[PDB]
A paper describes a structure:
Shiga toxin (Stx), a major virulence factor of enterohemorrhagic Escherichia coli (EHEC), can cause fatal systemic complications. All Stx proteins consist of a catalytic A-subunit and a B-subunit pentamer. The catalytic A-subunit, which is a member of ribosome-inactivating proteins (RIPs), has an RNA N-glycosidase activity that cleaves a specific adenine from 28S ribosomal RNA to inhibit eukaryotic protein synthesis. The B-subunit pentamer functions to bind Galα–Galβ–Glcβ-ceramide (Gb3), a glycolipid present on the surface of target cells.
To elucidate the precise manner by which these shorter peptides bind to Stx2a, X-ray crystallography analysis was performed with co-crystals of each peptide and the Stx2a holotoxin, which were obtained via the soaking method. These structures reveal that the AR4A-mono, R4A-mono, R3A-mono, and R2A-mono peptides bind tightly to the catalytic A-subunit. In all cases, the common Arg8-Arg9-Ala10 motif (numbering reflects residue position in full-length MMβA-mono) interacts equally with the Glu72, Tyr77, Val78, Asp94, Ser112, Tyr114, Thr115, Glu167, Arg170, Thr199, and Gly203 residues present in the catalytic pocket of the A-subunit, whereas the Arg8 and Arg9 residues of the motif electrostatically interact with Glu167 and Asp94, respectively. In addition, Arg6 and Arg7 of both AR4A-mono and R4A-mono electrostatically interact, respectively, with Asp94 of the A-subunit and Asp70 of the B-subunit, which is adjacent to the catalytic cavity. Overall, we find that the binding patterns of these shorter peptides are almost identical to that of MMβA-mono. Although the precise mechanism of the detrimental effect of the C-terminal Ala is remained to be elucidated, the presence of the amide group of the C-terminal Ala may contribute to fix the binding manner of the peptides with this Ala, such as MMbA-mono, AR4A-mono, R4A-mono, R3A-mono, and R2A-mono, to the same orientations which are clearly demonstrated in their crystal structures.
Author numbering:
A (entry chain G): 6 to 10
B (entry chain A): 1 to 242, 256 to 297
C (entry chain D), D (entry chain C), E (entry chain E), G (entry chain F): 1 to 70
F (entry chain B): 1 to 56, 60 to 70
Write the structure that this text describes.
Amino acid sequence: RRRRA
Amino acid sequence: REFTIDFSTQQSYVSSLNSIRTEISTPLEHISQGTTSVSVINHTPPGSYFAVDIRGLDVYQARFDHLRLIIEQNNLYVAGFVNTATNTFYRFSDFTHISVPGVTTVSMTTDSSYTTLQRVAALERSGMQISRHSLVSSYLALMEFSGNTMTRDASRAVLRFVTVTAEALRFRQIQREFRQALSETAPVYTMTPGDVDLTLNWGRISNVLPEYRGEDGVRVGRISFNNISAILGTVAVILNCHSQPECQITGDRPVIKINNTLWESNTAAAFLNRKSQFLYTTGK
Amino acid sequence: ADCAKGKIEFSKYNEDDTFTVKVDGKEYWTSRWNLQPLLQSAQLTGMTVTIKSSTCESGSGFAEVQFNND
Amino acid sequence: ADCAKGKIEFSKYNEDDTFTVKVDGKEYWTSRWNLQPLLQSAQLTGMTVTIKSSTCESGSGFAEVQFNND
Amino acid sequence: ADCAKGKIEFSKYNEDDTFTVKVDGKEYWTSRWNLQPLLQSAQLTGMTVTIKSSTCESGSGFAEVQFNND
Amino acid sequence: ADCAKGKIEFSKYNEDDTFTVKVDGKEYWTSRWNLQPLLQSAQLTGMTVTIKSSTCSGFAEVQFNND
Amino acid sequence: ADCAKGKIEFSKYNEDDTFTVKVDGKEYWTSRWNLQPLLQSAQLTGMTVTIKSSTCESGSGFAEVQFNND
């Protein structure tokens, strides 16, 4: 999973 | 739980962040000086959030005061934003498990990944400028926003507010660099490639720092710390890796100590997996 | 076509000496020998890889891949 | 068949240039040169591997292995 | 001449057997396979690389590069 | 036979393209090129290596164990 | 002779596919390709390397190097 804000 | 982040002055801003950190996290035994530490987020049940009320965009004035951020407590992700004037919670698609009583929840089609937000915003974080003025502009954009799908301006506003709230909570480096923009000079904070890399390595850092025992250095991918002051000057809050999925990429070994430096094991593995160079290059 | 952009969920060394990665729920193989350590290094460090190929169905081959930090 | 899934308990470079790993209590050898550093890096980081072979008894050969993120 | 100095932002292997890196906002490529693991390790460890060439045209090939920890 | 068991005290690339390791106070060399990264990785990560050989000089069999 | 002993200050891939390291203020190059990633690993991890050669003038060649940890 790519970085979430 | 609700906290205020007050942007009136550097003092009020740093005080706000420190109070949040104190409430939601516990210092690491081995990375703590005075009341300034790398702290581990205290365990909360999945779905737990805290609210952040944005204040002081206009210095010490009770205006621009209708924006609240919903922050998932275990990972500090912004789950969405609340317009307290319309009592509406705009929630990113990756946070349908975050339930906020009392508000109208608008479930958005947009997810909260930086990839998505940068695309919709047509704005890259590397080089992105943040000032008091653009935080006010961001606030107005979020207050004007309506509907289930983020617009460009709403996405730009979220990029800026997440940087100066959640990412600054995580990284004392970002707290320190951004806070200069709050001064009377009103300069511009430009978020650097190094700032971006820190945010992208937060999970990996979180898995490594609990193992620190005073080694001369710490190496986590592209991130390097050469002493405790560098660690403390850069990192303030990490995930609880005891646990959270962001703590692990692959394997089960957090660290390797090499020549008095604490390495993320996966980083060393990733440059020690090459075969003989002559065989590599000629075997095309 | 841009087939996949994501983290490597697993890699596999195949009996025909090609190398497979699973990205965004689909499997892609490459015969490019140079890519085998690079892809494993990506998996080890959680890099985002971008797989590009003329076909993007699971089981398609590729020779072009971008390695991103972000 | 999927013969053994788990961490590499030891690895061994062999006189005939094959390479042995012990997984889930059983030893397997491979003649795939490129697997040697890949397996060692998996070993050093505790990466779970799945050994795949026609026969799963300790002492069996393999030419296919999956690198997992468990 | 020193074309670019900085950390590697991304790297990419292309179907035409070239390996691109982006450094300090500029893209350069090399077909030296020797440089692929060296450049990727530099990328994943945050080394400062200095791309060097006789002429530093954007998008030009290179086969000289310095590696620094800082 | 198990010629030596322990951590690699130093390694050395040799002018004849062989590779030497010192383990448990004794020096051994190998001509197998792929052992060069395998041994240096072991040395860097603190692996216990077991150098094995019919005569315990050169070697081409070595076992690697994590600490 | 022991030409230089210390940590690798920088390394550099050269256009003739040789590889330069700077150790204790002196530069040495090797044409042994196998040394390129090993020296990079040593540089990344701060090993103490001992350059050995019958000529120890800075700028000279080498093909013998010892790697030590702290």
